[PDB]
């Protein structure tokens, strides 16, 4: 026979956005990223922010706390590109974003001129 189930139970598509591309320059290797989910949650129901690294150079070992909070702060970062995908989903909702952060090498001295 044919036992198919469409499943009338679905989740809401939330729009997760970190903000924009961030660029740092040594020695400064620290950067803070915030997750913005719309619509915004009430005073009771709060969404969870789960950060993760999917794109990273071999030079980087990869050390992050999946930003258990809404904001993620990295350190001891070296020159290179890093992509942090924050997956924010709820009981009847699901969403995720993407933010690329580039780290410029320590350029002792000016550039222009």
Swiss-Prot record:
Residues 20-106 form the PKD domain. Detected in adult brain cortex and fetal frontal lobe (at protein level). Highly expressed in brain cortex, putamen, amygdala, hippocampus and cerebellum. It is found in: Cell membrane; Early endosome membrane. Glycans are attached at residues 73, 100. It comes from the Eukaryota. N-glycosylated. O-glycosylated. Disulfide bonds: none annotated. It is linked to Dyslexia 2: A relatively common, complex cognitive disorder characterized by an impairment of reading performance despite adequate motivational, educational and intellectual opportunities. It is a multifactorial trait, with evidence for familial clustering and heritability. Involved in neuronal migration during development of the cerebral neocortex. May function in a cell autonomous and a non-cell autonomous manner and play a role in appropriate adhesion between migrating neurons and radial glial fibers. May also regulate growth and differentiation of dendrites. Homodimer. Interacts with AP2M1; required for clathrin-mediated endocytosis. This is Dyslexia-associated protein KIAA0319. It comes from Homo sapiens (Human). The lineage of its organism: Eukaryota, Metazoa, Chordata, Craniata, Vertebrata. The gene is KIAA0319. The chain holds residues 329 to 428 of 1072 of the full protein.
